[PDB]
Design a protein around this nucleic acid. Sequence first.
RNA 1: GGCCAGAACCAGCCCUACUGCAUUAUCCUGUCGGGGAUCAAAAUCCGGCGGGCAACGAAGUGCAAGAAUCUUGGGUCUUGG
RNA 2: UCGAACCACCUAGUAGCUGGUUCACAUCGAAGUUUCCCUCAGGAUAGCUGGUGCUAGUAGAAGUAUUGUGCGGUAAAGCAA
RNA 3: UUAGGGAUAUGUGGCGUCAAAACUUAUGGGCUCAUUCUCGAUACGUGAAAAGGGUGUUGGUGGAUACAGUUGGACCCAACCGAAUCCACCGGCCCCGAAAAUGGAUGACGCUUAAGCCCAAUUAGUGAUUGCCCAUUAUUCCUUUGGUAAGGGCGGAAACAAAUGGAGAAAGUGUAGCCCUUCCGAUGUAGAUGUGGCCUGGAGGUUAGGACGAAGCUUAUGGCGUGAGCCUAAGAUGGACCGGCCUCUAGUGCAGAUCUUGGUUGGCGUA
RNA 4: CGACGUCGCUUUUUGAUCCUUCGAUGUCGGCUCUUCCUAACCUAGCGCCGCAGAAGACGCUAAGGGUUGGAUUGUUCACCCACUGACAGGGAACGUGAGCUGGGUUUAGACCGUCGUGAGACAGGUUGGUUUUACCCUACUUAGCUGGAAAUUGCGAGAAAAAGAUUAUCCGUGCAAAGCGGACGUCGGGUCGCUUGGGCCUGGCGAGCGGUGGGUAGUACAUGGUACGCUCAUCACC
RNA 5: AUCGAAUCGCCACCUACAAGACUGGAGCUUGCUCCCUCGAAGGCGCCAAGUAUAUUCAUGAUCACAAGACA
Lengths: 178, 221, 53
Amino acid sequence: VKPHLRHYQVVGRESPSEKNPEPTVYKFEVFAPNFVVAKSRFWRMMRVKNKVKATHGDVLSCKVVKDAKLVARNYLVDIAYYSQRCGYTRMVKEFRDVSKTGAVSQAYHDLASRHRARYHNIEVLNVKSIPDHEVKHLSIAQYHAPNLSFPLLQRRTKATRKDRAIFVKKNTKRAVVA
Amino acid sequence: AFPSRKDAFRAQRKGAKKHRPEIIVIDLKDHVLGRAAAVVAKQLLLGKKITVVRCEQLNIAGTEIRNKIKYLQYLRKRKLTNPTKGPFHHRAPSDVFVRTVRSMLPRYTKRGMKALNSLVAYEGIPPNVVRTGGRVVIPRAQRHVCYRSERPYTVLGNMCKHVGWKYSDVVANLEKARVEKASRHHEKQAKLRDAWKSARKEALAKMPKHNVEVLKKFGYA
Amino acid sequence: ARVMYTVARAGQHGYHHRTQLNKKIYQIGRSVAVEPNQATTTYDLTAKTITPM
RNA sequence: GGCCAGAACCAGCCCUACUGCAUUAUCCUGUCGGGGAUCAAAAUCCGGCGGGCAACGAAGUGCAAGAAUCUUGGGUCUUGG
RNA sequence: UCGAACCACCUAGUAGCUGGUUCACAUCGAAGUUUCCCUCAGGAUAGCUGGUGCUAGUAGAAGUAUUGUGCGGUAAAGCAA
RNA sequence: UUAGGGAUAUGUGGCGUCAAAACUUAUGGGCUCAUUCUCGAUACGUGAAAAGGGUGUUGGUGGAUACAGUUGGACCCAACCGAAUCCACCGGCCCCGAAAAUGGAUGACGCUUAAGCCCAAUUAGUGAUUGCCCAUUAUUCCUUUGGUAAGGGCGGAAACAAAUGGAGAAAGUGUAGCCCUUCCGAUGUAGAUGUGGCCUGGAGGUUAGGACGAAGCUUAUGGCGUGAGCCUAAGAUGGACCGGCCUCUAGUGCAGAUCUUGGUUGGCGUA
RNA sequence: CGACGUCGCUUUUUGAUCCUUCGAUGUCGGCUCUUCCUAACCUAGCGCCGCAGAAGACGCUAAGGGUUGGAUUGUUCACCCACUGACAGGGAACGUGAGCUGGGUUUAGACCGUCGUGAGACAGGUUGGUUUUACCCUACUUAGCUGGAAAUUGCGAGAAAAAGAUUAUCCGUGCAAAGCGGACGUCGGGUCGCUUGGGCCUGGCGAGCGGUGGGUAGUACAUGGUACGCUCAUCACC
RNA sequence: AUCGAAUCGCCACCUACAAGACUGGAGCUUGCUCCCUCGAAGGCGCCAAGUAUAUUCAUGAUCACAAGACA
Ligand SMILES: [K+]
Ligand SMILES: [K+]
Ligand SMILES: [K+]
Ligand SMILES: [K+]
Ligand SMILES: [K+]
Ligand SMILES: [K+]
Ligand SMILES: [K+]
Ligand SMILES: [K+]
Ligand SMILES: [K+]
Ligand SMILES: [Mg+2]
Ligand SMILES: [Mg+2]
Ligand SMILES: [Mg+2]
Ligand SMILES: [Mg+2]
Ligand SMILES: [Mg+2]
Ligand SMILES: [Mg+2]
Ligand SMILES: [Mg+2]
Ligand SMILES: [Mg+2]
Ligand SMILES: [Mg+2]
Ligand SMILES: [Mg+2]
Ligand SMILES: [Mg+2]
Ligand SMILES: [Mg+2]
Ligand SMILES: [Mg+2]
Ligand SMILES: [Mg+2]
Ligand SMILES: [Mg+2]
Ligand SMILES: [Mg+2]
Ligand SMILES: [Mg+2]
Ligand SMILES: [Mg+2]
Ligand SMILES: [Mg+2]
Ligand SMILES: [Mg+2]
Ligand SMILES: [Mg+2]
Ligand SMILES: [Mg+2]
Ligand SMILES: [Mg+2]
Ligand SMILES: [Mg+2]
Ligand SMILES: [Mg+2]
Ligand SMILES: [Mg+2]
Ligand SMILES: [Mg+2]
Ligand SMILES: [Mg+2]
Ligand SMILES: [Mg+2]
Ligand SMILES: [Mg+2]
Ligand SMILES: [Mg+2]
Ligand SMILES: [Mg+2]
Ligand SMILES: [Mg+2]
Ligand SMILES: [Mg+2]
Ligand SMILES: [Mg+2]
Ligand SMILES: [Mg+2]
Ligand SMILES: [Mg+2]
Ligand SMILES: [Mg+2]
Ligand SMILES: [Mg+2]
Ligand SMILES: [Mg+2]
Ligand SMILES: [Mg+2]
Ligand SMILES: [Mg+2]
Ligand code: NA
Ligand code: NA
Ligand code: NA
Ligand code: NA
Ligand code: NA
């Protein structure tokens, strides 16, 4: 499937005033399902870092950065997540994917499965494609072999929806009840 | 079950030929118990007449010990003041499958009872079912597509044999005899099957050529 | 709120079928018309049948 | 015939098939160098420079007003004729 | 019939307590809180509610904002006051 | 959050059977195996569990060693061999910790290429942003009813016999509502009020019925009214009174007060 | 085994609360009787020990079975005597009063102590003091009648059966083989339509396998009563 | 024999078996190559006993349980 998180760049600033005639402009990278969530994360980060509230700020732009051409890559995703028991835990993981959005979406799925971390407690510090020789985990580097080949075993091939059947003869393809 | 003399007399008066209702025979070998039962129960409610065979070769996920223990926990439940009128714990694998289908059915309505009575269950394949027609399977309830092969699994006949079923050896010997008889009869009639295959092959050279072209177009020649 | 089946109640007594184990056969006697001395042993030589007086 | 039923059209509604504007550069290409891995390559990856439209069945990105008339959509025993 | 007999009457004795309380539809629709009471299973009395309306139908409108201008000592913080 | 209905959409909750929906959806990714209260699927619901522990598996954080570490030979110590190891800590799921009295409960069955847990989609790297199923909710259509209701018409326009277009048209609170169009509300205990709202005995008026059958009584006698009820039909019922309308009037409407009186009745052909 | 601490479980103790019951749910103990629980006293196995042996401690799986007789007390409880493999702890409306018992507690009589001027009071002592009803419904215990698979109906057709002109058109044997072994004939009539030496009914003769009855001989078996040989009569297949 | 019914795919080629970490067969190089019947059909049945030279179909009047049904 196509990734559920889109790559957003949000450019914004504090609204000009007399104390700050030319407020600093800030650029933010975030992976959000939609631009409303992307703007919400931007204003949260502005409040916690730059002490700027959304009620006194402007959003100069909020646009999607397109994915590059789909190529089998290795992505280094620097991510962090909060938990009550451990506070903020930061990890740097590697994934095999074809796009930044796919790798980040995979990282969010991994965090949810292996650490029960939801989207709103996760902060993506960085994500970048890395060379084969910079990969440390063998579970990722095993896909760099020039002659990677394996069979397809223990596969549940389901027929096309129109041709699916309830009762089929034992050693034929004839659908008795469909 | 024996027909009444009145029914036999009426059939003779009418002169009707032998009749068999539309019945689907399902071979339950290497079928998941719950998934097969759920599919069968839905089809029974839809109005199908279903006969299941080889119930003793149904499969349940997990080790045989834990499945035997689960049945033993089921067995321990009984009306203390009067075990008669209590839960009736049937040990035969075919009875186990019937109970599973029954629980999936609304057994306390006439419609539910009619669906339940439309089902016949056998251990092995009895002679009255052997020659009735081609048996069927449930693709979404088959072990080789449902269970991960690493996981241990239970065979219903083995589980029932150690919790009270007493006819495991009788069924095994009957099944052995039936397969031997079927294998001998399948060894015979091979000449008939081969002759028909060659007859179809030679028909292409004796039939109209444009008819051949149509067969090639639709992938039959 | 029931009477359990394990509680003693008045009812039919006797005339029940029983299978009794290990009853040793002490004698298999022939017909008195064939051999009158049925109760005679090698130790007690009195000529008597199995039927008591 | 004040009964049952099927097709026709009419009006009103209710579902659909038919899509344009803007945006895209952390992108697209070619080349030099590095770096990589090979039996030798290639690729993933990093820079400098030169070109650019990944291109309308490119993108699952923002908004879409596209007269069921042209080009006879379906439903109305959910309406009335 | 006795820790005050029986009969008739005063006597339908009184009861803040228990029980009961007979047709339909329609427009509206609560309170268990305030104060006083030998008050605490009850009442008066405001509130809530219905009915009747009166007055020139936006007049003296608001369980809400904004702006301006007042009021405060709880959450926090402090013991280096 | 509620007038009587239809259609179309939803809310909460769901789509393996029970049970409508993925006839067990995907051309989504991970995690988990749990043997006698039988792992788990328990928002509220604490409606059942903690400290502590695990060399079960799956993830992170920070360090150290590497021609290592482990074997084998020899001579606690160094040398062979040909790879990656080791130490500390923190998560996820699972497991131990975990003993009660009728047989029993993720609701039951069952489920482990989940039908469990976390996350994420709507037919799927294809070309765009509504998968499907259930309400007395929403939208819309028809009907009823009531408004703090909003409007229009009401000086008969003309013409028109039967044999062979019609009917109505009231200046009106309330009726079979004067008629038509339009908009909005509609549940409700205690309680209030209204009703050209229903019903009963009697009186003043009025208008009728009855020996060709009054009252009363009977009903698979239908019709009308949202309803109280009204009316007709039949009696192989009855035998002399009585209906409608306006007004007046009261000992005026019963399901139950261990209610009163009378009769009946299961227990019972029983003790 | 476990101080100082600390985390739990249990409802076999008391307490806290006042939700249910005041036009009444019979309130102690015992007797009797059944069942359940396991935190296991004995009994079955198994670890561990400051386990040589013997006797024992601790722990694990396991509630199938068993767990007593008495003195004092209304007592539950307690204590002692004695037996024993052991004399484990509990629940079931503090199980069980239309099952009993009524010693106790809790009326009215009466005595004592203390208290009160007194009538009277005292979880202080004492003695005496009515324990009602089942024939109803379920439950249980036995005891009878009797439908019924569409669990009463549909005509709604499913065999843990056979294996073929579509079960018709023979019977054995064989593996749903290859084959092999057997089968009462004959002469007429009548009736209907896969035309195949047709199906069906029926008559006259002659066989065969038989049933029944009579006669007659040996023999078996428990030995009165059946069977077997031979021979007649009759019936059936026909 | 009431009895008019609802059901609408037949088989003497499916009506044998087993495996889905792999059953068409080989080679060694163990995931590739080669060979084959090329690994994705149980057979028929759907109106001339067969793909042609044909042939009665009405008025049962335009839907209605097929007005018939032994394939
Ligand atoms: K999955
Ligand atoms: K823990
Ligand atoms: K109105
Ligand atoms: K009026
Ligand atoms: K009442
Ligand atoms: K009676
Ligand atoms: K007692
Ligand atoms: K007295
Ligand atoms: K006495
Ligand atoms: Mg498999
Ligand atoms: Mg258009
Ligand atoms: Mg009074
Ligand atoms: Mg009072
Ligand atoms: Mg009252
Ligand atoms: Mg209201
Ligand atoms: Mg009161
Ligand atoms: Mg404070
Ligand atoms: Mg401070
Ligand atoms: Mg201070
Ligand atoms: Mg069910
Ligand atoms: Mg369903
Ligand atoms: Mg699934
Ligand atoms: Mg809960
Ligand atoms: Mg729950
Ligand atoms: Mg909880
Ligand atoms: Mg369960
Ligand atoms: Mg549920
Ligand atoms: Mg798509
Ligand atoms: Mg109302
Ligand atoms: Mg009167
Ligand atoms: Mg009646
Ligand atoms: Mg009165
Ligand atoms: Mg009355
Ligand atoms: Mg301690
Ligand atoms: Mg109370
Ligand atoms: Mg009481
Ligand atoms: Mg009572
Ligand atoms: Mg009682
Ligand atoms: Mg134990
Ligand atoms: Mg035990
Ligand atoms: Mg026991
Ligand atoms: Mg207790
Ligand atoms: Mg008690
Ligand atoms: Mg009593
Ligand atoms: Mg009792
Ligand atoms: Mg006493
Ligand atoms: Mg006493
Ligand atoms: Mg006292
Ligand atoms: Mg029947
Ligand atoms: Mg029948
Ligand atoms: Mg028909
Ligand atoms: Na509510
Ligand atoms: Na409604
Ligand atoms: Na209205
Ligand atoms: Na209480
Ligand atoms: Na022991």
